[PDB]
């Protein structure tokens, strides 16, 4: 819990950055400044293919980084806004749980481990489809359900 750092634009909060493993990750589409000065200053790297925005954690003074896991068994997970249902190759969320500007909040498994990072969603009808960034054993991938608009 509480491993989330706010990304603030000039006049509002635009996104959220998280400490996963040895790296701080943020959505590359979010424009703003990291709340912490040592991370806002830290030379920071960009990849638009996965819309992901990385830097290496100063692990000497950030030992609270969350732990991760690439396994994605079927079923329910935690989103700081309710339960997400991971079904098939998709994540489904109650339509009223997420709002634009809340991107960057990780998805937790039942063990408290980060499984995926929400980059956006799609107004899906009775639910909303969750466009996320997950990883396999060695590589990252981005899951983009059709119709997903930017968050």
């Amino acid at each position: 819990n509480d491993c989330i750092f706010e990304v603030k634009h000039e006049g509002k909060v635009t996104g959220y950055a998280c400490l996963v493993g040895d790296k701080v990750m943020k959505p590359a589409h979010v424009k703003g400044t990291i709340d912490n000065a040592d991370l806002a200053k830290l030379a920071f790297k960009r990849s638009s293919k996965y819309d992901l925005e990385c830097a290496q954690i100063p692990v000497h003074m950030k030992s609270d980084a969350s732990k991760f896991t690439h396994e994605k068994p079927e079923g329910y997970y935690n989103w700081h806004h309710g339960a997400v249902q991971y079904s098939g190759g998709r994540f489904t969320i109650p339509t009223g749980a997420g709002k634009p500007g809340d991107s960057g909040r990780p998805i937790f498994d039942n063990k408290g481990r980060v499984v995926a990072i929400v980059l956006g969603g799609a107004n899906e009808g009775a639910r909303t489809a969750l466009s996320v960034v997950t990883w396999n054993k060695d590589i990252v991938t981005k899951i983009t359900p059709e119709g997903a608009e930017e968050w």
Binding site: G88, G89, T144, E146
Partner: protein
């Protein structure tokens, strides 16, 4: 003129029945949910994926 017409018709038949082979080889993948078309097969048959 006859030779040009015959050769152009042969080319048209070739491309059309290549399209027929494409449709026959591709339709079963577009019927199966999930549509995990291998990338090599997508390059060979020049298709777009349904899951982006």
């Amino acid at each position: 003129s006859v030779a040009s017409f015959v050769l152009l018709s042969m080319v048209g038949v070739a491309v059309g029945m290549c399209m027929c082979a494409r449709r026959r080889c591709i339709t079963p993948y577009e019927l199966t949910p999930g549509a995990t078309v291998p990338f090599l097969l997508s390059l060979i048959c020049c298709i777009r994926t349904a899951k982006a």
